[PDB]
Amino acid sequence: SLLPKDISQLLSLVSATINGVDNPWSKDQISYFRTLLKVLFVVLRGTKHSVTQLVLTTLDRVVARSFRNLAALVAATTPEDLALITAILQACLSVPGIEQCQLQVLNIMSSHNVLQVATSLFSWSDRLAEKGDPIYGELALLLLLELSALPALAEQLACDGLLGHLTSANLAGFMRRANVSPFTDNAGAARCYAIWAKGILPLLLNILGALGATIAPEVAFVLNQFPNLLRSSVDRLEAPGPHYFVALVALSEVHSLALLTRVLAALRSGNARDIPEVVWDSGAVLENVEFWLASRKVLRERLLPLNPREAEWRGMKASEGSGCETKLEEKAVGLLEGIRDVLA
């Protein structure tokens, strides 16, 4: 064989190279494996075709197998190794040609332990991360979340009672404490919010891939066991005049909840199965949204980036059809503008 000239031949060579590594995650050569995975991630993101069999071969031999090993708390491995694996999964599922072979992924995943152990890890988190924050809590859900974008795998989680494990977990008591907020001096509460906003809620939006005829009483019951959050989500976006700033995640949380409560309501009018009502004042949200839409100046002043990624497109700019000055504002505008459409 010659040198790789195609992006697919590069993918073959990198993947052929990953399998060659005798003992991954071993104290010696764990660091070399770490950058191989990073090379894989670059190539996979590079697969915009700017071939699909390799990606499916990668999902078993690389992604599934590695997570199985990551339950090692005996070993030079870190949370960021899991995050790297979660990342490689995203790159795989973004490649053109995938999403037609979802049962394939379902097949591949279910073969290993995976979501069973991913769920296990979620119920573990606090005993395994009270350095300050349940770091493995968010990592587990984000793994599940990425998979839940595939409707078939979404059905498996609910059938295996993921929503049951979510509320029964020890974590459910920490998220329930009234200190959970994106702007906390506490590391735990800050991660608790991350698990709920960036994990639980987008999970629920996807689990309703089974049309919400079923699971709707279960998704409504999940939300119903975090009322301090349903209450906080509205108060956080309150027009200026115990909250100083406003985050982008706060807008997506409310965006998620607005979709859930509306879809649930369009399923409650079915009058055919008991879908519990969820206490979430839509009225306050709408008004809060309008008095942030009509004030781009006071918006960009109070709006703060929380992630190094979000800060990138904060100092950036994207005018086009201009109602915003910076790109971060545009994304901020985009979110709460959709919340207006939904609740209407």
Numbering used by the authors: 1445 to 1494, 1510 to 1533, 1538 to 1704, 1721 to 1823
The authors write:
The Nic96 complex organizes four architectural proteins, Nic96, Nup157/170, Nup188, and Nup192, as well as the more disordered protein Nup53/59. Nup188 is a stacked helical protein with intrinsic flexibility. Moreover, we can show that both Nup188 and Nup192 specifically bind to FG-repeats and translocate across NPCs by facilitated diffusion.
The C-terminal fragment (Nup188C) includes residues 1445–1827, and we solved its structure to 3.0 Å resolution. Nup188C crystallized in space group P212121 with two copies per asymmetric unit. The C-terminal fragment of Nup188, Nup188C, is a right-handed arc-shaped superhelical structure built from 19 helices that form 6 helical repeats, which are stacked in regular order. The first helical pair (α1 and α2) forms a HEAT repeat followed by 5 ARM repeats. The inner face of the structure is built from helices α2, α5, α8, α12, α15, and α19. At the N terminus, helices α1 and α2 expose a hydrophobic surface, which strongly suggests that the full-length protein continues in a stacked pattern. This hydrophobic surface engages in a twofold symmetric crystal packing contact with a neighboring Nup188C molecule resulting in a horseshoe-shaped dimer.
